[PDB]
């Protein structure tokens, strides 16, 4: 079997230069509990509709369509 | 001196004469005038789908004595009416009145084949279920 090997000078430099997926493979980084890519893109495009923080938008909606 | 000009500066006369005389061939004439896209019911295509209008019985040319079992077909893409031979024993029982046939050419690029007068096309599929497969045992024709 033929492959490629890296031995870093220390484990701090291993964590610093080693890619995140290899550190997840070796146990030196946790896999992130991120969302799917289409959900992330849809959330971003939803946030593109809002200008400002939107607290005034939420309070104006809850004022106009409650009575 | 063999009729054509030979000189080093006669390439204009040679090429213009070749361009003029090239028109006398069948294929160059047909390709350059766009005959397949103006004439030729299969308007440049290899196959064409059409709707069966009628089952015809064509009497074969002499010295052959047979009825040839063709169909009259209106092409869907074009509206032109063509006559198409239904090739095998039986297989005119498989067509129907008024359903869908895929048609192809008939071997000789125009130019009706054999003893069959005026028929330049054959039926390849009917109802999209392939007359060879219908004829052997392979697939069953859909009822609707």
């Amino acid at each position: 079997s033929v492959g490629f090997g890296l031995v870093y000078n220390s484990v701090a430099e291993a964590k610093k230069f080693e890619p995140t997926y290899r550190l997840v493979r070796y146990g030196l980084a946790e896999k992130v509990e991120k969302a799917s890519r289409q959900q992330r893109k849809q959330k971003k495009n939803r946030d593109k509709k809002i200008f400002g923080t939107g607290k005034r938008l939420a309070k104006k909606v809850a004022r106009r369509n409650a009575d | 001196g063999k009729g054509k000009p030979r000189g080093l500066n006669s390439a204009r006369k040679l090429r213009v004469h070749r361009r003029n005389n090239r028109w006398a061939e069948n294929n160059y004439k047909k390709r350059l005038l766009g005959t397949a896209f103006k004439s030729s019911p299969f308007g440049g295509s290899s196959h064409a789908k059409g709707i069966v209008l009628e089952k015809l019985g064509i009497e074969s040319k002499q010295p052959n004595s047979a009825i040839r079992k063709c169909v009259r077909v209106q092409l869907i893409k074009n509206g032109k009416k063509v006559t198409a031979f239904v090739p095998n024993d039986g297989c005119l029982n498989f067509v129907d009145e008024n359903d869908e046939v895929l048609l192809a050419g008939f071997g000789r690029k125009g130019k009706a084949k054999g003893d069959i007068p005026g028929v330049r096309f054959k039926v390849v599929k009917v109802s999209g279920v392939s007359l060879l497969a219908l004829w052997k045992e392979k697939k069953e024709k859909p009822r609707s």
């Binding site: - | 089952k55 064509i58 009497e59 039986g90 297989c91 029982n93």
Partner: protein
């Protein structure tokens, strides 16, 4: 060129042809072993070499 011949007989001979099922037989080998079988029947142990050779002799 008459286009209204009778279509009553379409399929006549194939519809009245007697049905014979294909005879069940041993399989023939495929590929390299079939070309091996062809080579033994044609160039190694051929005996029907009347004139040059024959391949499908009928009853004489």
């Amino acid at each position: 060129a008459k286009v209204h011949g009778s279509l009553a007989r379409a399929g006549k001979v194939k519809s009245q042809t007697p049905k014979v099922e294909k005879t069940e037989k041993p399989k023939k080998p495929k590929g390299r072993a079939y070309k091996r079988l062809l080579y033994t029947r044609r160039f190694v142990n051929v005996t029907l070499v009347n004139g040059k050779r024959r391949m499908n002799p009928g009853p004489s």
